[PDB]
């Protein structure tokens, strides 16, 4: 076929040529156990689905329909944040405690400023592998970004050690090789 | 028992009925059901 | 294989918890049996009964020989099973899980129930349930015509039964059901005779639909089974008439 | 054009082949050489559509599991349609005596599955529904008390019932743990099972409403805890044909713990007499006249109580009439019974 031929010829012409160092920061990404614990963290903070939302809405609406106005109390919803402009919006306050960044986006240029932007804003970013795995934890097909701001007190101590873990595993390991021109070796 | 299973089963169908006390527990019956189902299909 | 770094820690912590509760059970039951109740929690024992948040009623223990049917549960999450409980499950033949057995309950029997509590499930059985178990399951290890003889045979021949049970005069496996329910003359003859039990797993599992069943059953088992680790743990009893509707 | 290859038909229908095997057995579509017009009839069927919908449903279940979203999978499983079997049962058997004619094979499988122990491939719920429907079927017979024929065999217990036309030849194998055969495939017998289950289900509906009583039969739970039988069910409200119905009228039995309780219980219920077994008693004897027992040495040896080996009941109902019990007295030998066939 043609499309199989092109998708195999793709990633050959990339690595054969010199990639700029603002790329290939991607795939210098998080290792196995740390990404695993990051997913264990963010599955604790799944956002509400449309079905669960509408279900709670029907519950409270049937409550008010009886009326049976039970109380007026709810702390806040805490969830991951996943809209890209919303993720950037949570930076430049700053509010992002952790950011996950997908390596694979076909318009890469949507994403390329985010490591430098969280670098200058001091936000603990981490480059995650695969936007589908982001979409799974956020009930989308893909997400390509994952910001997290608000955390319960049960999880806040896990958050800080995860931040220190990432800054040890990502910011220390890959920082100098981030500056280097990747690829260029023929296929 | 020397015959084929289609010939073995009907030939081993009748056996020495002793008394109330023992009934050997029906190995053949499930195979008979499956064979009848194969006859329908 | 490279196993992992985490499982080796979790097993150690879980074995620590289990050895601690087992030592608590052993010390408390030694002080009860030696009758040196000076500074302990309680003197007399208790029994939980979960029926249908669901209603959980407690009784004091009655020092009366009660027919129980035990059902081996898969133990807790990452636990190496300790050799004290391994000894008891070895005696009661409860390894190779999904495996119950009928047992006699006395006050000498009762202390081990507090020990092996995180690995089995208990309750009051009914005659129809005992009947169904024996008429549908059960194999006897048997010395046969000409065998190498690790040889097991399903329950068909009542004359094989009255052969090896003619000294007690026990015929006709219906009467074995009747005397397991009765325990008037001899239960333990039937108990050593019926020596293996096997129960199927309730959910086939691997496949799209049955994983839902597995998750819902793990949630149900989390609701039902309770792990006190107090050494004054009330003995949890469940409807085996409900349970064998699932497993048989 | 008369013969169609199974691959051709299964790709024209766009169904999986195992489900095509379901549908052929399910509608009674018979031959890898199949009638074109029968496949044309099969070409539009909502159960086929719901099968394909179940395939897509399981695919959505797989993506629900692979995304890990448990609650949406719960919503999918709860909000799920079930294909029923019932319409092609009615348009397959419009005339109810044709269902009475073809209930005969339908009983036999369901009785065998009611005997069968719980496995992985056959669910207990399957066996629970089987034993429930089979106990219902037996409990209906003991209402009118109308069979006539009895057969004792190494292969089964063949009873044919004289009900609303033909005598119906159902068999129950004895309640023994059976070694499972690895040779068989359940995937066919489960389809036969479900088809016969739904068919016999609606036939039990017409037989319970036609007999004028409630189609769900209530049971006392503690009566079921005594014995899981037809006698567990109580049968509500909203003569007997001579002689076999109300044979042994006003007659009190004492079946032992030694005897097989089940088929003798059902025969006494076909007689209308009472059942007293000591096996039921130890769960926890004024009018008892007769012991059904098969033992060499009888202990209490009451001269008032009649001691009988059970073939008397097997021979009296095959004759419809009373016979002397000197042969049936233990330990006298018995006539080699050859049933009326």
CSV table of N, CA and C in Angstrom, one decimal, chain C residues 73-216:
chain,number,residue,atom,x,y,z
C,73,UNK,N,-10.9,-19.7,50.6
C,73,UNK,CA,-10.9,-18.5,49.9
C,73,UNK,C,-9.5,-18.2,49.5
C,74,UNK,N,-9.3,-17.6,48.3
C,74,UNK,CA,-8.0,-17.1,48.0
C,74,UNK,C,-7.6,-16.0,49.1
C,75,UNK,N,-6.4,-16.2,49.6
C,75,UNK,CA,-6.0,-15.4,50.7
C,75,UNK,C,-5.7,-14.0,50.3
C,76,UNK,N,-5.4,-13.1,51.3
C,76,UNK,CA,-5.2,-11.7,51.0
C,76,UNK,C,-4.0,-11.4,50.2
C,77,UNK,N,-3.8,-10.2,49.8
C,77,UNK,CA,-3.4,-9.7,48.4
C,77,UNK,C,-2.0,-10.3,48.1
C,78,UNK,N,-1.0,-9.9,48.8
C,78,UNK,CA,0.4,-10.4,48.6
C,78,UNK,C,0.8,-10.9,50.0
C,79,UNK,N,0.5,-12.1,50.3
C,79,UNK,CA,0.8,-12.7,51.6
C,79,UNK,C,1.5,-14.0,51.4
C,80,UNK,N,2.7,-14.2,52.0
C,80,UNK,CA,3.2,-15.5,52.2
C,80,UNK,C,2.5,-16.1,53.4
C,81,UNK,N,1.9,-17.3,53.2
C,81,UNK,CA,1.1,-17.9,54.2
C,81,UNK,C,2.1,-18.5,55.3
C,82,UNK,N,1.9,-18.2,56.6
C,82,UNK,CA,2.8,-18.6,57.6
C,82,UNK,C,2.6,-20.1,57.9
C,83,UNK,N,3.7,-20.7,58.5
C,83,UNK,CA,3.8,-22.1,58.6
C,83,UNK,C,2.8,-22.7,59.7
C,84,UNK,N,2.4,-21.8,60.7
C,84,UNK,CA,1.4,-22.3,61.6
C,84,UNK,C,0.1,-22.5,60.9
C,85,UNK,N,-0.4,-21.5,60.1
C,85,UNK,CA,-1.6,-21.7,59.4
C,85,UNK,C,-1.4,-22.6,58.3
C,86,UNK,N,-0.2,-22.7,57.7
C,86,UNK,CA,0.1,-23.7,56.7
C,86,UNK,C,-0.1,-25.1,57.2
C,87,UNK,N,0.3,-25.3,58.5
C,87,UNK,CA,0.1,-26.6,59.1
C,87,UNK,C,-1.4,-27.0,59.2
C,88,UNK,N,-2.2,-26.0,59.6
C,88,UNK,CA,-3.6,-26.3,59.8
C,88,UNK,C,-4.3,-26.5,58.5
C,89,UNK,N,-4.0,-25.7,57.5
C,89,UNK,CA,-4.6,-25.9,56.2
C,89,UNK,C,-4.1,-27.2,55.6
C,90,UNK,N,-2.9,-27.6,55.9
C,90,UNK,CA,-2.4,-28.9,55.5
C,90,UNK,C,-3.2,-30.0,56.1
C,91,UNK,N,-3.4,-29.9,57.5
C,91,UNK,CA,-4.3,-30.9,58.1
C,91,UNK,C,-5.7,-30.9,57.5
C,92,UNK,N,-6.3,-29.7,57.4
C,92,UNK,CA,-7.6,-29.6,56.9
C,92,UNK,C,-7.8,-29.7,55.4
C,93,UNK,N,-6.6,-29.9,54.7
C,93,UNK,CA,-6.5,-30.1,53.3
C,93,UNK,C,-7.2,-29.0,52.4
C,94,UNK,N,-6.9,-27.8,52.8
C,94,UNK,CA,-7.5,-26.6,52.2
C,94,UNK,C,-6.6,-25.9,51.2
C,95,UNK,N,-5.4,-26.4,50.9
C,95,UNK,CA,-4.6,-25.9,49.9
C,95,UNK,C,-5.2,-26.3,48.5
C,96,UNK,N,-4.8,-25.7,47.4
C,96,UNK,CA,-5.5,-25.8,46.1
C,96,UNK,C,-6.9,-25.2,46.3
C,97,UNK,N,-7.0,-23.9,46.3
C,97,UNK,CA,-8.1,-23.1,46.7
C,97,UNK,C,-9.4,-23.4,45.9
C,98,UNK,N,-10.5,-22.8,46.3
C,98,UNK,CA,-11.9,-23.3,46.0
C,98,UNK,C,-12.1,-24.7,46.5
C,99,UNK,N,-11.9,-24.9,47.8
C,99,UNK,CA,-11.9,-26.3,48.3
C,99,UNK,C,-12.5,-26.2,49.8
C,100,UNK,N,-13.7,-26.7,50.0
C,100,UNK,CA,-14.3,-26.7,51.3
C,100,UNK,C,-14.2,-28.1,51.9
C,101,UNK,N,-14.6,-28.2,53.1
C,101,UNK,CA,-14.7,-29.6,53.8
C,101,UNK,C,-15.7,-29.4,54.9
C,102,UNK,N,-16.4,-30.5,55.2
C,102,UNK,CA,-17.3,-30.5,56.4
C,102,UNK,C,-16.5,-30.8,57.7
C,103,UNK,N,-16.7,-30.1,58.7
C,103,UNK,CA,-16.0,-30.2,60.0
C,103,UNK,C,-16.9,-30.2,61.2
C,104,UNK,N,-16.4,-30.7,62.3
C,104,UNK,CA,-17.1,-30.7,63.5
C,104,UNK,C,-16.6,-29.5,64.3
C,105,UNK,N,-17.6,-28.8,65.0
C,105,UNK,CA,-17.2,-27.7,65.8
C,105,UNK,C,-17.3,-28.0,67.3
C,106,UNK,N,-16.2,-28.0,68.0
C,106,UNK,CA,-16.2,-28.0,69.4
C,106,UNK,C,-15.3,-26.9,69.9
C,107,UNK,N,-15.1,-26.9,71.3
C,107,UNK,CA,-14.3,-25.8,71.9
C,107,UNK,C,-12.8,-26.1,71.7
C,108,UNK,N,-12.4,-27.4,71.4
C,108,UNK,CA,-11.1,-27.6,71.0
C,108,UNK,C,-10.8,-27.3,69.5
C,109,UNK,N,-11.9,-27.3,68.7
C,109,UNK,CA,-11.8,-27.0,67.3
C,109,UNK,C,-11.8,-25.5,67.2
C,110,UNK,N,-12.6,-24.7,68.0
C,110,UNK,CA,-12.8,-23.3,67.9
C,110,UNK,C,-11.5,-22.4,67.8
C,111,UNK,N,-10.4,-22.6,68.6
C,111,UNK,CA,-9.3,-21.7,68.5
C,111,UNK,C,-8.6,-21.6,67.2
C,112,UNK,N,-8.6,-22.7,66.4
C,112,UNK,CA,-8.0,-22.6,65.1
C,112,UNK,C,-8.8,-21.8,64.1
C,113,UNK,N,-10.1,-21.6,64.4
C,113,UNK,CA,-10.9,-20.8,63.5
C,113,UNK,C,-10.5,-19.4,63.6
C,114,UNK,N,-10.1,-18.9,64.7
C,114,UNK,CA,-9.6,-17.5,64.8
C,114,UNK,C,-8.2,-17.4,64.1
C,115,UNK,N,-7.5,-18.5,64.0
C,115,UNK,CA,-6.2,-18.5,63.2
C,115,UNK,C,-6.4,-18.4,61.7
C,116,UNK,N,-7.1,-19.4,61.2
C,116,UNK,CA,-7.2,-19.5,59.7
C,116,UNK,C,-8.3,-18.6,59.1
C,117,UNK,N,-9.0,-17.8,59.9
C,117,UNK,CA,-10.0,-16.9,59.5
C,117,UNK,C,-9.7,-16.0,58.3
C,118,UNK,N,-8.5,-15.5,58.0
C,118,UNK,CA,-8.3,-14.7,56.8
C,118,UNK,C,-8.1,-15.5,55.5
C,119,UNK,N,-8.4,-16.8,55.6
C,119,UNK,CA,-8.2,-17.6,54.4
C,119,UNK,C,-9.3,-18.5,53.9
C,120,UNK,N,-10.4,-18.5,54.8
C,120,UNK,CA,-11.5,-19.4,54.5
C,120,UNK,C,-12.8,-18.6,54.8
C,121,UNK,N,-14.0,-19.2,54.5
C,121,UNK,CA,-15.2,-18.6,54.8
C,121,UNK,C,-16.1,-19.7,55.4
C,122,UNK,N,-17.0,-19.3,56.4
C,122,UNK,CA,-17.6,-20.2,57.3
C,122,UNK,C,-19.1,-19.9,57.3
C,123,UNK,N,-19.9,-20.9,57.7
C,123,UNK,CA,-21.3,-20.6,57.9
C,123,UNK,C,-22.1,-21.8,58.4
C,124,UNK,N,-23.4,-21.7,58.5
C,124,UNK,CA,-24.3,-22.8,58.8
C,124,UNK,C,-24.8,-23.4,57.5
C,125,UNK,N,-24.6,-24.6,57.2
C,125,UNK,CA,-25.1,-25.2,55.9
C,125,UNK,C,-26.4,-25.8,56.2
C,126,UNK,N,-27.1,-26.1,55.1
C,126,UNK,CA,-28.4,-26.8,55.1
C,126,UNK,C,-28.3,-28.2,54.5
C,127,UNK,N,-29.3,-29.0,54.8
C,127,UNK,CA,-29.3,-30.4,54.4
C,127,UNK,C,-29.4,-30.5,52.8
C,128,UNK,N,-30.1,-29.6,52.2
C,128,UNK,CA,-30.2,-29.6,50.8
C,128,UNK,C,-28.9,-29.2,50.2
C,129,UNK,N,-28.1,-28.3,50.8
C,129,UNK,CA,-26.8,-27.9,50.3
C,129,UNK,C,-25.8,-29.0,50.4
C,130,UNK,N,-25.8,-29.7,51.6
C,130,UNK,CA,-24.9,-30.8,51.8
C,130,UNK,C,-25.3,-31.9,50.8
C,131,UNK,N,-26.6,-32.2,50.7
C,131,UNK,CA,-27.1,-33.1,49.7
C,131,UNK,C,-26.6,-32.8,48.3
C,132,UNK,N,-26.7,-31.6,47.9
C,132,UNK,CA,-26.3,-31.2,46.5
C,132,UNK,C,-24.8,-31.3,46.3
C,133,UNK,N,-24.0,-30.9,47.3
C,133,UNK,CA,-22.6,-31.1,47.2
C,133,UNK,C,-22.2,-32.6,47.1
C,134,UNK,N,-22.8,-33.5,47.8
C,134,UNK,CA,-22.4,-34.8,47.8
C,134,UNK,C,-23.0,-35.6,46.5
C,135,UNK,N,-24.2,-35.2,46.1
C,135,UNK,CA,-24.8,-35.9,45.0
C,135,UNK,C,-24.2,-35.3,43.7
C,136,UNK,N,-23.5,-34.2,43.7
C,136,UNK,CA,-23.0,-33.6,42.5
C,136,UNK,C,-21.5,-33.6,42.5
C,137,UNK,N,-20.9,-33.6,43.6
C,137,UNK,CA,-19.4,-33.5,43.7
C,137,UNK,C,-18.9,-34.5,44.7
C,138,UNK,N,-17.6,-34.8,44.6
C,138,UNK,CA,-17.0,-35.8,45.5
C,138,UNK,C,-16.4,-36.9,44.8
C,139,UNK,N,-15.1,-37.1,45.0
C,139,UNK,CA,-14.4,-38.3,44.5
C,139,UNK,C,-13.7,-39.0,45.7
C,140,UNK,N,-13.6,-40.3,45.6
C,140,UNK,CA,-13.0,-41.0,46.7
C,140,UNK,C,-11.7,-41.6,46.2
C,141,UNK,N,-10.6,-41.4,46.9
C,141,UNK,CA,-9.4,-42.2,46.6
C,141,UNK,C,-9.7,-43.6,47.0
C,142,UNK,N,-9.2,-44.5,46.1
C,142,UNK,CA,-9.8,-45.9,46.1
C,142,UNK,C,-8.8,-46.9,45.7
C,143,UNK,N,-8.8,-48.0,46.4
C,143,UNK,CA,-8.0,-49.2,46.1
C,143,UNK,C,-8.9,-50.1,45.2
C,144,UNK,N,-8.5,-50.2,43.9
C,144,UNK,CA,-9.3,-50.7,42.9
C,144,UNK,C,-8.8,-52.1,42.5
C,145,UNK,N,-9.3,-52.5,41.3
C,145,UNK,CA,-9.1,-53.8,40.7
C,145,UNK,C,-7.6,-54.0,40.5
C,146,UNK,N,-7.0,-53.3,39.6
C,146,UNK,CA,-5.5,-53.4,39.4
C,146,UNK,C,-5.0,-52.0,39.0
C,147,UNK,N,-4.4,-51.3,39.9
C,147,UNK,CA,-4.1,-49.9,39.8
C,147,UNK,C,-2.7,-49.6,40.3
C,148,UNK,N,-2.1,-48.6,39.8
C,148,UNK,CA,-1.0,-48.0,40.5
C,148,UNK,C,-1.5,-47.2,41.8
C,149,UNK,N,-2.8,-46.9,41.7
C,149,UNK,CA,-3.6,-46.4,42.8
C,149,UNK,C,-3.2,-45.1,43.5
C,150,UNK,N,-3.0,-44.0,42.7
C,150,UNK,CA,-3.5,-42.7,43.2
C,150,UNK,C,-4.9,-42.5,42.5
C,151,UNK,N,-5.8,-43.4,42.8
C,151,UNK,CA,-7.0,-43.5,41.9
C,151,UNK,C,-8.3,-43.1,42.6
C,152,UNK,N,-9.0,-42.1,42.0
C,152,UNK,CA,-10.2,-41.5,42.6
C,152,UNK,C,-11.3,-41.8,41.7
C,153,UNK,N,-12.5,-42.1,42.3
C,153,UNK,CA,-13.7,-42.5,41.6
C,153,UNK,C,-14.9,-41.7,42.2
C,154,UNK,N,-15.7,-41.2,41.3
C,154,UNK,CA,-16.9,-40.5,41.7
C,154,UNK,C,-17.9,-41.4,42.3
C,155,UNK,N,-18.9,-40.8,43.1
C,155,UNK,CA,-19.8,-41.5,43.9
C,155,UNK,C,-21.0,-42.1,43.1
C,156,UNK,N,-20.8,-43.3,42.7
C,156,UNK,CA,-21.9,-44.0,42.1
C,156,UNK,C,-22.3,-45.3,42.8
C,157,UNK,N,-21.3,-46.1,43.2
C,157,UNK,CA,-21.5,-47.5,43.7
C,157,UNK,C,-21.7,-47.4,45.2
C,158,UNK,N,-22.9,-47.7,45.6
C,158,UNK,CA,-23.2,-47.8,47.0
C,158,UNK,C,-22.6,-49.1,47.6
C,159,UNK,N,-22.3,-50.0,46.8
C,159,UNK,CA,-21.8,-51.3,47.2
C,159,UNK,C,-20.3,-51.2,47.5
C,160,UNK,N,-19.5,-50.4,46.7
C,160,UNK,CA,-18.2,-49.9,47.1
C,160,UNK,C,-18.2,-49.2,48.4
C,161,UNK,N,-19.3,-48.4,48.7
C,161,UNK,CA,-19.5,-47.8,49.9
C,161,UNK,C,-19.6,-48.7,51.1
C,162,UNK,N,-20.6,-49.6,51.0
C,162,UNK,CA,-20.8,-50.6,52.1
C,162,UNK,C,-19.8,-51.7,52.1
C,163,UNK,N,-18.9,-51.8,51.1
C,163,UNK,CA,-17.7,-52.6,51.2
C,163,UNK,C,-16.8,-52.1,52.3
C,164,UNK,N,-16.3,-50.9,52.1
C,164,UNK,CA,-15.3,-50.3,53.0
C,164,UNK,C,-15.9,-49.7,54.3
C,165,UNK,N,-17.2,-49.7,54.4
C,165,UNK,CA,-17.9,-49.1,55.5
C,165,UNK,C,-18.9,-50.0,56.1
C,166,UNK,N,-18.6,-51.3,55.9
C,166,UNK,CA,-19.5,-52.4,56.4
C,166,UNK,C,-19.3,-52.6,57.9
C,167,UNK,N,-18.1,-52.2,58.4
C,167,UNK,CA,-17.8,-52.4,59.9
C,167,UNK,C,-18.7,-51.4,60.7
C,168,UNK,N,-18.8,-50.2,60.2
C,168,UNK,CA,-19.8,-49.3,60.8
C,168,UNK,C,-21.2,-49.6,60.2
C,169,UNK,N,-21.3,-50.4,59.2
C,169,UNK,CA,-22.5,-50.7,58.6
C,169,UNK,C,-23.1,-49.5,57.8
C,170,UNK,N,-22.2,-48.9,57.1
C,170,UNK,CA,-22.6,-47.6,56.4
C,170,UNK,C,-22.7,-47.9,54.9
C,171,UNK,N,-23.9,-47.8,54.4
C,171,UNK,CA,-24.3,-48.1,53.0
C,171,UNK,C,-24.7,-46.8,52.4
C,172,UNK,N,-24.8,-46.7,51.0
C,172,UNK,CA,-25.8,-45.9,50.3
C,172,UNK,C,-25.6,-44.4,50.6
C,173,UNK,N,-24.7,-43.8,49.9
C,173,UNK,CA,-24.1,-42.4,50.1
C,173,UNK,C,-25.1,-41.4,50.6
C,174,UNK,N,-26.4,-41.5,50.3
C,174,UNK,CA,-27.5,-40.8,51.0
C,174,UNK,C,-27.4,-41.0,52.5
C,175,UNK,N,-27.0,-42.1,53.0
C,175,UNK,CA,-26.8,-42.2,54.4
C,175,UNK,C,-25.5,-41.5,54.9
C,176,UNK,N,-24.5,-41.4,54.0
C,176,UNK,CA,-23.3,-40.6,54.4
C,176,UNK,C,-23.7,-39.2,54.5
C,177,UNK,N,-24.6,-38.7,53.6
C,177,UNK,CA,-25.2,-37.3,53.8
C,177,UNK,C,-25.9,-37.3,55.1
C,178,UNK,N,-26.7,-38.3,55.4
C,178,UNK,CA,-27.5,-38.3,56.5
C,178,UNK,C,-26.7,-38.3,57.8
C,179,UNK,N,-25.5,-38.9,57.8
C,179,UNK,CA,-24.8,-39.0,59.0
C,179,UNK,C,-23.8,-37.9,59.2
C,180,UNK,N,-23.5,-37.2,58.0
C,180,UNK,CA,-22.8,-35.9,58.1
C,180,UNK,C,-23.7,-34.9,58.7
C,181,UNK,N,-25.0,-34.9,58.3
C,181,UNK,CA,-26.0,-34.1,58.9
C,181,UNK,C,-26.3,-34.5,60.3
C,182,UNK,N,-26.2,-35.8,60.6
C,182,UNK,CA,-26.5,-36.3,61.9
C,182,UNK,C,-25.4,-36.2,62.9
C,183,UNK,N,-24.3,-36.8,62.5
C,183,UNK,CA,-23.1,-37.0,63.4
C,183,UNK,C,-23.4,-37.7,64.7
C,184,UNK,N,-24.4,-38.6,64.6
C,184,UNK,CA,-24.8,-39.3,65.8
C,184,UNK,C,-23.9,-40.4,66.2
C,185,UNK,N,-23.5,-41.3,65.2
C,185,UNK,CA,-22.6,-42.4,65.5
C,185,UNK,C,-21.2,-42.0,65.1
C,186,UNK,N,-20.9,-41.7,63.8
C,186,UNK,CA,-19.6,-41.4,63.3
C,186,UNK,C,-19.6,-40.5,62.1
C,187,UNK,N,-19.1,-39.3,62.4
C,187,UNK,CA,-18.9,-38.3,61.3
C,187,UNK,C,-17.5,-38.5,60.7
C,188,UNK,N,-16.5,-38.8,61.5
C,188,UNK,CA,-15.1,-38.7,61.1
C,188,UNK,C,-14.7,-39.8,60.1
C,189,UNK,N,-15.5,-40.9,60.2
C,189,UNK,CA,-15.4,-42.0,59.2
C,189,UNK,C,-15.7,-41.4,57.8
C,190,UNK,N,-16.9,-40.7,57.7
C,190,UNK,CA,-17.3,-40.1,56.5
C,190,UNK,C,-16.3,-38.9,56.1
C,191,UNK,N,-15.8,-38.3,57.1
C,191,UNK,CA,-14.9,-37.1,56.9
C,191,UNK,C,-13.6,-37.5,56.3
C,192,UNK,N,-13.0,-38.6,56.8
C,192,UNK,CA,-11.8,-39.1,56.1
C,192,UNK,C,-12.1,-39.8,54.8
C,193,UNK,N,-13.3,-40.3,54.7
C,193,UNK,CA,-13.7,-41.0,53.5
C,193,UNK,C,-13.8,-40.1,52.3
C,194,UNK,N,-14.5,-38.9,52.5
C,194,UNK,CA,-14.9,-38.0,51.4
C,194,UNK,C,-13.8,-37.1,51.1
C,195,UNK,N,-12.5,-37.4,51.4
C,195,UNK,CA,-11.3,-36.6,51.7
C,195,UNK,C,-11.1,-35.5,50.7
C,196,UNK,N,-11.2,-35.6,49.4
C,196,UNK,CA,-11.2,-34.4,48.6
C,196,UNK,C,-12.5,-33.8,48.3
C,197,UNK,N,-12.6,-32.4,48.3
C,197,UNK,CA,-13.7,-31.7,47.7
C,197,UNK,C,-13.1,-30.7,46.7
C,198,UNK,N,-13.8,-30.5,45.6
C,198,UNK,CA,-13.4,-29.5,44.6
C,198,UNK,C,-14.6,-28.7,44.2
C,199,UNK,N,-14.4,-27.4,44.1
C,199,UNK,CA,-15.5,-26.5,43.6
C,199,UNK,C,-14.9,-25.7,42.5
C,200,UNK,N,-15.7,-25.4,41.5
C,200,UNK,CA,-15.3,-24.6,40.3
C,200,UNK,C,-15.1,-23.1,40.8
C,201,UNK,N,-14.3,-22.4,40.0
C,201,UNK,CA,-14.3,-21.0,40.1
C,201,UNK,C,-15.6,-20.4,39.6
C,202,UNK,N,-16.2,-19.4,40.2
C,202,UNK,CA,-17.5,-18.9,39.9
C,202,UNK,C,-17.6,-18.2,38.6
C,203,UNK,N,-16.5,-17.5,38.2
C,203,UNK,CA,-16.4,-16.6,37.0
C,203,UNK,C,-15.3,-17.1,36.2
C,204,UNK,N,-15.5,-17.3,34.9
C,204,UNK,CA,-14.5,-17.8,33.9
C,204,UNK,C,-13.4,-16.8,33.7
C,205,UNK,N,-13.7,-15.5,33.7
C,205,UNK,CA,-12.7,-14.5,33.9
C,205,UNK,C,-12.3,-13.9,32.6
C,206,UNK,N,-11.3,-14.5,32.0
C,206,UNK,CA,-10.5,-13.8,30.9
C,206,UNK,C,-11.3,-13.7,29.7
C,207,UNK,N,-11.6,-12.4,29.3
C,207,UNK,CA,-12.6,-12.1,28.3
C,207,UNK,C,-13.3,-10.8,28.8
C,208,UNK,N,-14.0,-10.2,27.9
C,208,UNK,CA,-14.4,-8.8,28.1
C,208,UNK,C,-15.5,-8.8,29.1
C,209,UNK,N,-16.5,-9.7,29.1
C,209,UNK,CA,-17.7,-9.6,29.9
C,209,UNK,C,-17.3,-10.0,31.4
C,210,UNK,N,-16.5,-11.0,31.5
C,210,UNK,CA,-16.4,-11.7,32.8
C,210,UNK,C,-15.5,-10.9,33.8
C,211,UNK,N,-14.7,-10.0,33.2
C,211,UNK,CA,-13.9,-9.1,34.1
C,211,UNK,C,-14.8,-8.2,34.9
C,212,UNK,N,-15.9,-7.8,34.3
C,212,UNK,CA,-16.9,-7.0,35.1
C,212,UNK,C,-17.4,-7.8,36.3
C,213,UNK,N,-17.7,-9.1,36.0
C,213,UNK,CA,-18.1,-10.0,37.1
C,213,UNK,C,-17.1,-10.1,38.2
C,214,UNK,N,-15.8,-10.2,37.7
C,214,UNK,CA,-14.7,-10.3,38.7
C,214,UNK,C,-14.6,-9.1,39.5
C,215,UNK,N,-14.7,-7.9,38.9
C,215,UNK,CA,-14.6,-6.7,39.7
C,215,UNK,C,-15.7,-6.6,40.7
C,216,UNK,N,-17.0,-6.9,40.2
C,216,UNK,CA,-18.1,-6.8,41.1
C,216,UNK,C,-18.0,-7.8,42.2
